[PDB]
């Protein structure tokens, strides 16, 4: 097997966690508390190709350190995860950006873009806005819904071959 | 951060079995960490007992892995450990531990609850 | 213990001591090492990891080496705080098993 080291970025309450765990545990958390950062393992196929993903869905407060710079640079992937209804989450995307760059020293770092939430009727972010600016980073954009599943496979799975083109 | 905490009688009587729980929070046991049991006999260096993944396998100490079960509860985000056959000589602290990290390896305790103290004695 | 450290070390404040650690080829030789440090009346904390490394919080007077089937941790400008007892912890292979030192009580001498 292959293995795929994806770090889920993205501010609070934009559903990283649920995003993870639908991934890894099949079915949907209600709340999850917003402090915990773990490491999660999966085996899946990709294109015919056996995977190994290990996935850190980030988490705590905003703060800065050489060893969380490390944990951050062992990713090979970045998913940034912004939610449809909270134009804020969108806003800050630049800002994860940024830091994986700095982290991994590399204006080339596989990325996707991720509108989350997409099942709900109310949106703020409008999908081409979004898309305009996967566009200009020259990365995909997936929405995504971790209450239905819609979509979840998808935006880990197009990291995953993001990474392999990175090769 | 994940934080863990032993429990379980402080006082063992031999034929009874020493039976302790790790009630893991801050963090889910079912995260791609390796879950371990250590004691410290009062004054005394650290044992290893073993280790379990929250899929159900299982590395023991040799000197103890016929006396040793380690499980995992994954409804109640815990980990326990029976330890059979007990003498006096078992009496110590014990510490559950989380590490043996799959993203990034710090060891094998990166991690430890308080300890706990078990005095074994019939 | 299946790993051998000196049973004591100990300095004056501001000088630099050395815990040695020796195991075999089924440990310390094929296999990184970790280094803990109980303070009196805690648990163990990790000190070093991967024979050389840092974590956070960890001042870089604290440093580790491996060199063969041997290891050693160096703590340089000895503070007070520093006395404590240090395990030092590694894989083995014919056990398929964590191994520990048997720990050295560091003193700081006062």
């Known amino acids: 097997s292959t293995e795929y080291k994806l770090v889920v970025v993205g501010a609070c309450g934009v559903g990283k966690s649920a995003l993870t765990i639908q991934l890894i545990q099949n079915h949907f958390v209600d709340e999850y508390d917003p402090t915990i950062e773990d490491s999660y393992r999966k085996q899946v196929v990709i294109d015919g190709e056996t995977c190994l993903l290990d996935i850190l869905d980030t988490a705590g407060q905003e703060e800065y350190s050489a060893m969380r710079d490390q944990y951050m640079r062992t990713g090979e992937g970045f998913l940034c995860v912004f939610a449809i209804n909270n134009t804020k989450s969108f806003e800050d995307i630049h800002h994860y950006r940024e830091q994986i760059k700095r982290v991994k020293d590399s204006e080339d770092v596989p990325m996707v873009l991720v509108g989350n939430k997409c099942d709900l009727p109310s949106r703020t972010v409008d999908t081409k806005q979004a898309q305009d600016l996967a566009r200009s980073y020259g990365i995909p954009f997936i929405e995504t819904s971790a209450k239905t599943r819609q979509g979840v496979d998808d935006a880990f799975y197009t990291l995953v071959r993001e990474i392999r083109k990175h090769k | 951060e994940v934080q863990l905490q032993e429990s379980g009688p402080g006082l063992v009587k031999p034929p009874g079995t020493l039976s302790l729980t790790c009630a893991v929070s801050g963090g889910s046991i079912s995260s791609s960490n390796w879950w371990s049991w250590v004691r410290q006999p009062p004054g005394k260096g650290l044992e290893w007992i073993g280790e379990?993944?929250?899929?159900?396998?299982?590395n023991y100490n040799p000197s103890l892995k016929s006396r040793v079960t380690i499980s995992v509860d994954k409804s109640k985000n815990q980990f326990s450990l029976k330890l059979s056959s007990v003498t006096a000589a078992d009496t110590a602290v014990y510490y559950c531990a989380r590490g043996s990290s799959s993203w990034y390896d710090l060891g094998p305790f990166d991690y430890w609850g308080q300890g706990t103290l078990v005095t074994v004695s019939s | 213990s299946v790993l051998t450290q000196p049973p004591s070390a100990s300095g004056t404040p501001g000088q630099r001591v050395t815990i040695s650690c020796s195991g075999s080829?089924?440990?310390?030789?094929?296999?990184?090492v970790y280094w803990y440090q109980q303070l009196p009346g805690t648990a163990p904390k990790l000190l070093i990891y991967?024979?050389?490394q840092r974590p956070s919080g960890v001042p870089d007077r604290f440093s580790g080496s491996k060199s063969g089937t041997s290891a050693s941790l160096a703590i340089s400008g000895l503070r007070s705080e520093d006395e404590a007892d240090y395990y030092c912890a590694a894989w083995d292979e014919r056990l398929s098993g964590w191994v520990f030192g048997g720990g050295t009580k560091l003193t700081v001498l006062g």
């Open positions: 080829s089924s440990n310390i030789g094929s296999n990184y």
């Open positions: 991967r024979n050389n």
């Open positions: 379990i993944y929250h899929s159900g396998s299982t």
